Amino acid sequence: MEVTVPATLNVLNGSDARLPCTFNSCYTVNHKQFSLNWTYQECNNCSEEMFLQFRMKIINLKLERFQDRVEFSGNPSKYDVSVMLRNVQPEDEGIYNCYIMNPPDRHRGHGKIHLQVLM
Amino acid sequence: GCVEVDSETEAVYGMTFKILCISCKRRSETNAETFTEWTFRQKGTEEFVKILRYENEVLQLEEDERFEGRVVWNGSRGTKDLQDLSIFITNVTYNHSGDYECHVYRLLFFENYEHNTSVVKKIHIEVVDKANRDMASIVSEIMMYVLIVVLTIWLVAEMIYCYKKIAAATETA
């Protein structure tokens, strides 16, 4: 599955960071079966923390590390699964992953963004 | 396949008779489980009484004098899916004259759905001493004989006149 994300995303401290993620799946997005997981790892060999998931609807896990700054910013039926991180902080630097399953499409998609926080 | 033929309405004393009840499922590929119940009302008696029930490859006959020892199952065999619910009378009496109701109780098995249906056929039976023959056969046999004789006569008449005419022509020549 083709997943389009910026490999590196550079955002100023305090600004809003939209993490763009779209995916080219031919099959129509069935909200009763579509699956999305967004996770966060400090490093490629570090632990992933799921912070948002679409099962039947948008589930925001409200991880303490993000406070209430995470928002969904996509539209699954339009093949957009982007998220928004409001008022970015230096600790938000790291790796963010968009996992995508669009049954009955066989292949799972994976986008990886390296978010860097500028002064 | 399945063809619904109405029953014969006349039976002769002392012989055997097959009352015909045929109910066909509206589509043949379908699967069902059918049972039957039969009710009989004798001439000049006003209530239809139950005389038999056939279900799951077994006839259950009711305690009636007029049909005891005298009814067998003449319909579908080997299935729960019956389309022929015919019965057979082995020795006809004058107490078998009357009207009959054939009740068909079909349970169709579809995908996520069972439909219980019912159909009723009515049969009138007159019990007679001898087999009164049919109007059709009679009039059709006579009609064939009259038409054939008429055609023969017409062919002869034309043969006669033309022969005479050709003989006259030969004499003129």
Binding site: - | S28, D84, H115
Partner: protein
């Protein structure tokens, strides 16, 4: 001549430039011979060794003045360039250009290019190219920049005349150059790679003769213009009919009646997606992706109890099948015209709308599917014939010219080895060894026709030893010949070489495939030395790759390019979007993911199957692309295929055969042996006979003459016709409902006793009138006789209790042959039989040549597939088990031991033996039931081993190879023989139409005049002031043009209507249609008031007035029918009157009016051939009904389409007259052994038992019907082509008057002043020069007057009438009216002049001249 060859030096440039300046101060076609790209005339002979490949001066004079330079290669190829500097830089003299030119016209230039292009073609076939391939792509992109630069440097670029951008195929090279680099620098991948298939087209520009071919195919398309217009028009008129009759019918479904949880169709229809959930609320047949169709009339499909029929939800086939909008309706109609999977559709429309609507399909098949296609074929053939003719005429002319030039040139000139090898040349014997080898080939092929699947190891031993013994004897023939005739002498003959190759391939097999085993099968073609129609197959094939080889190559290129384009465009969509077209998410059978599967769809499209693959394309890749691509392949492709077929036909038909040599000039050794046999068998028998001899009543005649009167009377004839028809009609009541109609069943048994009585009497009368001879020598009487004999056998057996002995019971099914009594009585059927039986002898031979060729394919099928189509299948879901589990028969059986629903089953139609292979080949050739057979073949593994998906994928070649040879070249041979035959049928009878009867010919002749009339009188104007103005407006051409544009607008308004359309849209279209009618009605009245009565003197004018009243009543009555009456069916059928308004566009079109007059001329022949076919169906219906009505309902056979009733039999028979679905109808008739059928099955309402079918009877039925069907439609095509071909090449008109004869007499009175009625032959040459045109003969008359052969009376005198008649004949020609007018002239002269004695002719003007000489 040749001495003209000189190097363009600046001096000749300056002498060309000076001349141009002179022309300017003062201020032609060139040698087609010399014209570039041509051979230098032999008139110039050889080139000086230094002048070749050098800028030389212009030969052709036309250009000698303009500025140019020509260059010739070492192959005398003329190349013309521009003397003008290339991009204002390079000159012819410049060494830089000199080199570009040197390369441009050499052969190592173009071979290199051919290679490059072909190698790129191989690389375009890969779907996932690896990485070592981008280097190659650079490398090819550069072999292309090079050539383009060489052309730019040498010819210049664009400014001049013969410059690079002037060539139209160099534009293609230019786009190839730009798409490559431009897109690369910019960097859809698919789009980029499809832009690359354009490189595949440089082949046309490089292989020689591919452009002439491509240009000729563009000439076949331009002539196809008015047929293409008629085609679109008819397709649209029928589409608008199906839209009106069927709008929304395909939507109907069977909706459950009880719904829980307060639910509605509405709510349920918003909350459902899967087919698993639609299968809970709607009714679906097991294994069907669509909900089952139903309807609301008693002749439509029915729903099961528990469901009710309703219109809701998608249309069938992913929604692509419908008459809902005009665009979908047009698609169903194109589909019906091409007859692609049309039976599926015919079946869905009958089930959903009623069985009555079949009339609709009949008309469509007859008009669109048959007639439009016929027109196309005819036009294309006429194009090709005019083309061949131009070729020859010009070719003969040119050859004559060259021979004349040659003539002018001529005028200007004016030991032990020896012994035994000669013994072996003697041992080989023409009558014997050669006849031996023939017998052995036949024996060998028969021996190989005995391989079959249930074969014992003994029967296998005997087969392989035989296959070796024959091999050895063919090889001894080989070696012996090779040592007798010298080896160089031996490989001189091509038959010898072929035999040698076969022998060596057989020896290699002996040292060692499965397919190699069957090459020894081509030794059969060695029977073509003597058998002359096998030699016609060999020449068709030979021409495909010889004299039509370039066209064949162009076909190959096109298929290839379509295959690769298709792949690049949809290939990755087929993988990504697969779950949509398959539930197991794996690729379907047909797809474009790789090159091979992609070639296969294109080939299937050429075969005529496109829709089912296209449905899928549309689902994975979108509608627009799929429809553009599949349509291009259907058009271009079928056109290249047709032009090939026609070129083959024409050529091999009359071009190749010219009786140049004698019939077997070197007496066929076969015939030599035949002569030897005539010597022997005759001589020896005679000697044996010699040895045996040495050892040893007016009144009876009067009854005869009476019988004649009657049997020959028109009332006897009508009593009987009536009687045949009634007795034929009585059989149609003997269906499975007969026991529900007691009275009609008794009426008919008695009607049958009578029918037999009458026919016996008729037979007796014929005997008395004709006598046993004139009766038993007549074939039609022989047929009556037999019918009455079987009838009498049934009657007498029956009245003797023999009514159920089973053989007598099968004799009763023979009554289906009673309607054959109908053939003798109707001339139309009698003349078509006469035509067909005349063809039988020529057809019999094609069939032998065709049965034999199909036998090689059959034996190979067996060697390839016998025993390998058995599979382990799970019966409840009907699916093959894998091979991981249960890979063998043993394991299939072990699985049976545990699980009940397990079966090891073989396909019914297969290649287990040659007989079965024949049936399989028929299904493949006809494209009906072939997919399954191919799948079993490509899944094949080995005997008793479970099939695996596409294990033998490349077995499809077997099938493509058979289609080409067994179908394509076989049909070609069949058509070529039918045409020389039908042509001969017309010739012996004087050229009269073979299919039309006497009275019908008189009508035909009267209609050929209708379409021929000359201009009429101008309609008198109304003298009144206002009426006259009305007249001048109506009679103007602008009026007509406006009426025609309004009809087009009316057609548009009808095409806008669609299912679901709002009520406001309904209302606006009603009112627009009301203004159209009021306009078309006022048109009526203006014309009707200005033209007065003369309105009704025009036929179109009367169609126009009948269209206004069908329109006005239709609107009013449909309004009345939708309100104070109710009948949706009636409303829709009466609104069809609006089609009347649109048909009036043919008065406008002049080329579809002429094509339509061609259809009207052909209607009598068609009515006559159609009567034959209808009666043939009626018999096959009665038979179906007596044999096939109880058979199990699977595949094609179902609750609506079966043989249970007469109406139901005719439906099936009409479907298979076109060959559609026949294999689905046969399959259930092949169930004879349980577990396929139940022998004891009970049928409620009947005493008949079992649901089995008899394969012997079934196979016979279907094959017989399809063959007769095919035969009678060949005749429909003959008839139509005959009409089209004359209609399109015929014109007539007459030009003379009473004043011409007055001129003749006014000139006659000047030469015969006494009125003697005679002139001297002396004066005739001055008389004939004193008449005005048309009768004028200009001086010198005397040669023409001697060629008229005028009679001469006593004294070298000629009579007035002889001169008049000879001059009349000169103007009018030799028509049939000339001899009737002549008879009248003779009669009217004999009544005016009783004196016969003065008119006796002694000599004629030609005879006289001969005597003088």
């Amino acid at each position: 001549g040749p001495q003209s060859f000189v190097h363009f030096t600046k001096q000749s440039l300056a002498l060309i430039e000076q001349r141009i300046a002179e022309r300017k101060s003062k201020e032609p076609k060139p040698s087609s011979d010399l014209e570039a790209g041509k051979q230098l005339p032999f008139i110039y002979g050889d080139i000086p060794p230094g002048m070749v490949s050098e800028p030389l001066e212009d030969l052709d004079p036309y250009y000698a003045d303009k500025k140019t330079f020509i260059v010739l290669n070492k192959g005398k190829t003329i190349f013309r360039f521009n003397a003008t500097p290339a991009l204002y830089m390079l000159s012819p003299f410049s060494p830089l250009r000199r080199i570009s030119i040197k390369i441009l016209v050499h052969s190592l230039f173009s071979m290199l290019i051919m290679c490059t292009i072909l190698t790129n073609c191989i690389f375009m076939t890969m779907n996932n190219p690896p990485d070592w391939t981008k280097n190659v792509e650079y490398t090819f992109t550069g072999i292309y920049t090079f050539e383009s630069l060489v052309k730019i440097l040498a010819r210049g670029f664009c400014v001049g005349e013969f410059t690079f951008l002037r060539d139209p195929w160099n534009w293609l090279d230019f786009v190839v150059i730009v798409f490559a680099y431009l897109t690369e620098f910019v960097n859809n991948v698919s789009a980029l790679r499809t832009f690359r298939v354009l490189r595949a087209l440089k082949t046309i520009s490089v292989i020689p003769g591919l452009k002439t071919i491509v240009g000729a195919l563009i000439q076949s398309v331009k002539k196809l213009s008015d047929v293409m217009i008629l085609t679109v028009f008819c397709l649209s008129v029928f589409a608008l009919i199906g839209l009106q009759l069927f709008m929304g019918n395909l939507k109907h479904k069977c909706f459950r009646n009880s719904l829980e949880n307060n639910e509605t169709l509405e709510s349920i229809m918003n909350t459902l997606e899967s087919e698993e959930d639609f299968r809970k609320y709607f009714y679906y047949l097991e294994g069907s992706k669509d909900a089952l169709l139903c309807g609301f009339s008693t002749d439509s499909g029915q729903c099961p109890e528990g469901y009710t029929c309703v219109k809701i939800g998608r249309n069938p086939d992913y929604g692509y099948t419908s008459f809902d909008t005009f665009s979908w309706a047009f698609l169903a109609l194109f589909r019906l015209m091409t007859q692609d999977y049309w039976e599926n559709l015919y079946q869905q429309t009958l089930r959903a709308a009623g069985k009555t609507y079949m009339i609709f399909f009949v008309v469509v098949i007859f008009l669109g599917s048959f007639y439009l296609i016929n027109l196309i074929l005819a036009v294309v053939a006429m194009a090709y014939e005019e083309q061949n003719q131009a070729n020859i005429e010009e070719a003969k002319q040119k050859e004559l010219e060259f021979q004349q030039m040659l003539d002018r040139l001529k005028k200007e000139q004016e030991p032990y080895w020896i012994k035994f090898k000669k013994c072996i040349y003697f041992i080989v014997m023409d009558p014997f060894v050669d006849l031996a080898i023939t017998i052995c080939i036949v024996l060998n092929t028969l021996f190989m026709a005995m391989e079959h699947h249930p074969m014992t190891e003994e029967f296998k031993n005997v087969l392989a030893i035989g296959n070796l013994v024959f091999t050895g004897i063919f090889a001894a023939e080989m070696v012996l010949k090779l040592i007798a005739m010298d080896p160089y002498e031996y490989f001189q003959v091509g038959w010898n070489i072929f035999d040698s190759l076969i022998v060596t391939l057989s020896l290699v097999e002996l040292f060692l495939l499965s397919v190699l085993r069957s090459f020894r099968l081509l030794r059969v073609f060695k029977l073509a030395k003597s058998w002359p129609t096998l030699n016609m197959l060999i020449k068709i094939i030979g021409n495909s790759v010889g004299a039509l080889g370039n066209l064949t190559l162009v076909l190959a290129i096109i298929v290839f390019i379509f295959a690769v384009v298709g792949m690049q465009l949809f290939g990755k969509s087929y993988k990504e979007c697969v779950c949509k077209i398959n539930d197991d998410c794996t690729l379907p059978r047909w797809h474009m993911n790789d090159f091979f599967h992609s070639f296969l769809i294109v080939f299937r499209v050429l075969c005529g199957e496109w829709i089912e693959t296209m449905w899928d394309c549309m689902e994975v890749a979108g509608q627009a692309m799929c429809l553009i691509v599949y349509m291009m392949v259907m058009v271009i492709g079928n056109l290249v295929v047709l032009n090939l077929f026609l070129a083959l036909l024409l050529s091999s038909f009359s071009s190749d055969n010219l009786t140049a040599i004698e019939e077997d000039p070197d007496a066929n050794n076969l015939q030599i042996a035949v002569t030897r046999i005539k010597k022997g068998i005759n001589y020896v028998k005679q000697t044996l006979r010699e040895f045996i001899l040495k050892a040893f009543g007016k009144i009876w005649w009067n009854i005869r003459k009476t019988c004649y009167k009657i049997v020959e009377h028109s009332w006897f004839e009508s009593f009987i016709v009536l009687m045949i028809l009634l007795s034929s009609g009585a059989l149609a009541f003997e269906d499975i409902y007969i026991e529900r109609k007691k009275t009609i069943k008794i009426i008919l048994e008695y009607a049958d006793k009578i029918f037999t009585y009458i026919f016996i009497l008729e037979m007796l009368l014929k005997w008395i009138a004709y006598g046993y001879k004139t009766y038993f020598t007549n074939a039609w009487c022989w047929l009556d006789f037999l019918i009455v004999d079987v009838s009498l056998v049934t009657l007498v057996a029956n009245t003797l209790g023999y009514s159920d002995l089973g053989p007598i019971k099968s004799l009763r099914t023979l009554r289906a042959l009673r309607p054959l009594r109908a053939l003798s009585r109707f001339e139309g059927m009698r003349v078509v039989v006469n035509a067909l039986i005349g063809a039988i002898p020529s057809i019999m031979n094609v069939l032998l040549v065709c049965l034999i060729f199909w036998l090689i394919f059959s034996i190979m099928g067996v060697n390839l597939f016998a025993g390998k189509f058995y599979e382990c299948i799970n019966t409840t879901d009907g699916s093959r088990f894998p091979a991981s589990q249960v890979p063998n028969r043993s394991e299939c059986f072990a699985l049976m031991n545990v699980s009940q629903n397990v079966r090891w089953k073989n396909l019914k139609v297969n290649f287990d033996n040659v007989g079965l292979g024949y049936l399989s080949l028929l299904q493949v050739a006809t494209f009906k039931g072939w997919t399954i057979i191919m799948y079993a073949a490509v899944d094949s593994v080995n005997v008793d081993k479970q099939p695996k998906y596409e294990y033998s994928l490349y077995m499809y070649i077997y099938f493509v190879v058979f289609i080409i040879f067994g179908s394509f070249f076989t049909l070609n041979l069949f058509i070529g023989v039918i045409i020389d035959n039908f042509n001969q049928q017309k010739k012996k009878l004087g050229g009269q139409d073979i299919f039309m009867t006497e009275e019908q010919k008189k009508y035909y002749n009267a209609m050929k005049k209708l379409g021929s009339k000359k201009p009429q009188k101008p309609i008198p104007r109304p003298g009144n002031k206002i009426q006259g103005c009305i007249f001048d407006l109506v009679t103007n051409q602008a009026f007509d043009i406006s009426i025609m544009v309004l009809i087009c607008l009316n057609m548009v308004t009808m095409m806008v209507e669609k299912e679901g359309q709002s009520q406001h849209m309904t209302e606006v279209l009603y009112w627009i249609n009301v203004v159209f009618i009021i306009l078309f009605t006022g048109e009526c009245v203006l014309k009707l008031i200005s033209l007065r009565h003369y309105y009704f003197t025009v036929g179109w004018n009367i169609f126009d007035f009948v269209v206004v009243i069908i329109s006005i009543v239709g609107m009013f009555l449909a309004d009345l029918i939708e309100t104070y009456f109710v009948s949706p069916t009636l409303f829709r059928v009466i609104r069809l009157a609006r089609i009347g308004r649109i048909l009036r566009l043919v008065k406008g079109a002049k080329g579809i009016r002429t094509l339509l007059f061609a259809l009207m001329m052909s209607l009598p022949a068609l009515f006559n051939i159609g009567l034959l076919l209808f009666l043939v169906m009626f018999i096959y219906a009665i038979f179906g009904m007596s044999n096939f009505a109880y058979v199990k309902k699977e595949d094609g056979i179902n609750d609506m389409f079966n043989f249970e009733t007469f109406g139901n039999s005719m439906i099936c028979l009409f479907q298979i007259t076109t060959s559609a679905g026949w294999d689905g109808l046969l399959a259930p008739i092949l169930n004879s052994k349980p577990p396929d059928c139940d022998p004891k099955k009970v049928h409620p309402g009947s005493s008949v038992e079992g649901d089995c079918g008899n394969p012997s009877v079934g196979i016979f039925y279907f094959v017989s019907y399809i063959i007769i069907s095919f035969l009678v439609v060949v005749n429909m095509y003959i008839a139509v082509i005959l009409e089209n071909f004359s209609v399109a090449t015929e014109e007539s008109t007459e030009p003379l008057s009473e004043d011409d004869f007055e001129m003749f007499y006014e000139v006659w009175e000047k030469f015969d002043p006494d009125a003697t009625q005679f002139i001297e032959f002396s004066k005739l040459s001055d008389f004939a020069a004193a008449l005005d045109p048309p009768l004028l003969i200009a001086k010198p008359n005397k040669v023409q007057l001697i060629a008229m052969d005028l009679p001469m009376v006593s004294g070298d005198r000629i009579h007035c009438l002889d001169i008049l008649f000879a001059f009349t004949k000169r103007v009018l020609g030799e028509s049939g009216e000339m001899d009737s007018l002549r008879s009248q002239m003779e009669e009217r002269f004999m009544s005016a002049n009783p004196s016969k004695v003065s008119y006796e002719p002694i000599t004629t003007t030609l005879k006289r001249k001969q005597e003088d000489v």
